[PDB]
Symmetry: C6
Subunit: 210 residues, 6 copies
Amino acid sequence: PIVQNLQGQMVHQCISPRTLNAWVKVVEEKAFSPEVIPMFSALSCGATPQDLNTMLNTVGGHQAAMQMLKETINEEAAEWDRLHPVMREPRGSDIAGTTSTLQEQIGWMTHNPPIPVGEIYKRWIILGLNKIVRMYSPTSILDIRQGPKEPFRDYVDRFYKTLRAEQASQEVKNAATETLLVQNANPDCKTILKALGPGATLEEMMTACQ
Amino acid sequence: PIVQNLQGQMVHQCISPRTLNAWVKVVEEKAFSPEVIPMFSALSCGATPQDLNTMLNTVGGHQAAMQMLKETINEEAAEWDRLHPVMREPRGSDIAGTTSTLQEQIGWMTHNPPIPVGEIYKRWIILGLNKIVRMYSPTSILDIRQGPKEPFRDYVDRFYKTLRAEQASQEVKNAATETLLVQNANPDCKTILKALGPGATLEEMMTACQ
Amino acid sequence: PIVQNLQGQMVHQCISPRTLNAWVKVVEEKAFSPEVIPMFSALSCGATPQDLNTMLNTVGGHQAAMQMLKETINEEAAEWDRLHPVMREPRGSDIAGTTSTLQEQIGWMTHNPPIPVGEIYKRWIILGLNKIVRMYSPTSILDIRQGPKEPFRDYVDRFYKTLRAEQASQEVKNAATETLLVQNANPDCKTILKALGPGATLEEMMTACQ
Amino acid sequence: PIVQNLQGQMVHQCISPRTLNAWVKVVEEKAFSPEVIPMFSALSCGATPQDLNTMLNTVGGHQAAMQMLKETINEEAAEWDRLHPVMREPRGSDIAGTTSTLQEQIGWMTHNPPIPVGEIYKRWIILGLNKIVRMYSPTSILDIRQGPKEPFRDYVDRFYKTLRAEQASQEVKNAATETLLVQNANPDCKTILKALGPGATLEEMMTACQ
Amino acid sequence: PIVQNLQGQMVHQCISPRTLNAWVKVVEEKAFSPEVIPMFSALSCGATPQDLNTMLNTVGGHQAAMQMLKETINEEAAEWDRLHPVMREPRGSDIAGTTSTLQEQIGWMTHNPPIPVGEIYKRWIILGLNKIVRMYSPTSILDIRQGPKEPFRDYVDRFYKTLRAEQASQEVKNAATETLLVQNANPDCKTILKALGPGATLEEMMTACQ
Amino acid sequence: PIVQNLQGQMVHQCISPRTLNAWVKVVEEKAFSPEVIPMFSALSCGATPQDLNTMLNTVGGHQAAMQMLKETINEEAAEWDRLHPVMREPRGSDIAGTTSTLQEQIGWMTHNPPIPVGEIYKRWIILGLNKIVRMYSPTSILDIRQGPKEPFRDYVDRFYKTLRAEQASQEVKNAATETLLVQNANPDCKTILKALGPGATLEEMMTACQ
């Protein structure tokens, strides 16, 4: 990835074994849980398209997901080529890092103004990963219900984990979300939440059901 | 996080995978014990709101706590907007890192005088974490007493651990707290402490009951 | 390898023990899976031919594969010698790091215009590794068929992993490959895929068969 | 901690996760053995009071020890305030790191002449740690006596470890301690040591009694 | 070892603990398999004679091998003294690292032109290690015969591993080597090798014997 | 330890936790085997007396050995004081690091001409460690005997390991050493060794009995 040196300029540096190990271990252990995407966005700080290609190709399993990612990147490159018809300006395949040289990528990312091919490739990969995570949700939100003896903490944590997996975003707060949350609880906490009144925060609901 | 180079200028640095792994392991293994807050304040030395959001979103489980944290940050941002009506001035959401880009944050944190958006966001996150840790107390302070044969050392350890968890702070010393400690002590140690009289430090009580 | 310091010139630095340990661990663990080649291209970023020889000779086991690699490198060196009739210009063996000193390799890797002996040797080694990986595939692509109760997701995983093993590249799918994919599926999923019609993406096939 | 950069200036640096993990592991595993204090003085080299507070607060267990440490710090700060009647001059709490900011601490630590607030706070913490270590001695010195078949080396190891714990120092050997050491030895070794006469060092005693 | 700094000169650096740990672990775990020599030549890149002595004296076991290494080094030093009749010019014992100081070694390795005492010492140590590796071959190559149900790949693995051990070098290719390889195979593969015809490469033999 | 910065000057640096962890682990695991002294020499590269004291105090067990080391240090300091009757020149105590501040030590180790208190202190510590390792020898050299069927390799390994321990030095080859080596060999090997002829090298003996 491109970093900043002590002279004050952007100079390319090789990708480190630590970053590669971190990414491979994360993908192998956490599978495609929703928090992998922030991990991908953090490990790819200032990455060139070649670095992102290395990170994607290094993954051993989940080849169906990687094929979906490849198809999504191709679709995004086609859309970019349609929206941007014609140093040489980049094309979709050049941004994808399959028809361009590392030197050209570094020249683009250091140009004034910069042409962040790495950022665009990261956005395409992030769209692909969002689709993959949304497809790999283990269960639907409508089937999350508190057990007969399950504490409110466990039920709420499972409900919000599922709702993060489904919508592919942690920020899943909605009025219908709260209604579904209160509906699926056990009757003991259901009555308390019903009597708590509208507009209550999740903190107050957890305190009341503690 | 913004760091200082050998030249002597504040520049951005990519967030290291080592810090991310440390924070993830700490949250996974420490649950929400009161010692997590100093760890978060240490790992985030000089971080920007983007880095804080990365560190928060990378947490795997405990989604209810993250939702409470998000709601608390929203409340604090609303309060900040109310107290500050209207480079572009940072709004509550911009400080929270929802509608802000990296360049804007770095310009804010390198301005003269600096607008410490990172510090403000860290304060809001610290408030949310304090509330979460307080909520995560396994038992109240009034429910802990020394056992029939428990050494006074372990009893004081448990008492002060519970006291730290209850108030989400370590410095919770009070005359009422000392009276509670001597009240719940074993009858032999209670008699010894009563004979020792008021004004005795914790060290003297520990020495006497040895 | 050769890296750039703050003075502004390429300088040679010793190969770090971290890279060597990572490469040895990768070879010992993953055997010759198709993802070894991206790891080799990543760990050897800017490595002079001496470093490539160090990385190749450090591998303990799999001596047949290393002998095939040696023969392939010799053949490529002979072709290079034939195509290039005769600072001294490099030869095939000089590029292969057998009859060249470290100083000569540094000079070749740093002149203007550069003679990327490291990159040429890397391409030869990657060709040899492609041959090895293609030879080491456990199964043929015609032996992959979905089981009576195996999910379509796992069937696609196996199919595309084996396909990457054979062609030694991720870009291995084709129209005939898509026909093979739909033909080898279980009849229940085969009917759905047939009803989905031509032009269907892998995403739609995965969604429909669930 | 404040460290000297390559340009030759004393600049503030964030405290690395490795030091924090090392200190946490040392406290967690070694309890409060006498060797912890040298580890504390080595890990916290050049630290400002904020870093010392972070390193103290990060400890999870042993809350009674931390309470005693806080009491000792308060006593020493009161003494400092008494002895110093009144850039702004530091106070007891300012040195302790509770009513001071990072900028003020850095200014004090880098003023000419320096006001070593970090060193003074470290001395107070060392006093507290010495008190805790002395309190946490499992056994008294007089209770170390050689077994019927116990080797002399292990007996001397136990004796000197116990003596090290008590006086909160390693250089605790003395003529009275030498007499105590020769008193509790086994009669077979006791007669040999008595015949060896005064003036014999520990090496000669160990050699004679093997 | 000696490295290159940002000032552009050659200056000394202490041998890092990671290098020492890597060397000790490699030597202990891998015994004296032929891949140790590439590891030794990679870890000691640019090492001074004192660094080589530190790396050799740190090994715990295999003391007979270390004594043979010392004998070989002494013989080579005597030869060097014989071949060179007589800042002081180096002698055999100075390159051996027994009668030279670190300052003198650095002056030798940084003189104009450099007198690579480190490289000469490393060559002597490599000759000694080659002798030890040859002596540590578990079995003779003539006893390697393919099993009744052993795959030809595993037979080639064992054959070439043993042959590399015997010569302490990877260059074991020969017409007699190929004849010995084909003679020891099972008749089922021996007939196929005979039918393949002379002059075939190893890859063709592997593919035809599958 | 005092190291050289990029500007080209000697400045102090806090002892890194990696060095301390390595030193403590080695001392705890290997006990006082003769290979510890090279490790201590490597890890203490360029250290001040304060760093040497830090590394000595951090050792938890084996307090008898540490007391012997302290006695040896005191004796050497007394000898230094006698040999050198009285920036202030360093006395024995100041060299030992008990009565000298870090500023004085840095001023001493960076003066022109240098006064290497660290080197002298390391010499004293190495003398003490040699004495400790010599005392800690598990067995005598005369008791080293070959088993009836124990391979000659293991016999020579044990013999030279013990003889290295016996004299606290690896350079232990001698005429009497070889005489005892051939005297304690098994009769089957003794016949071959006797018929081999005087003056034979160790490699010839190993090959003859292999």
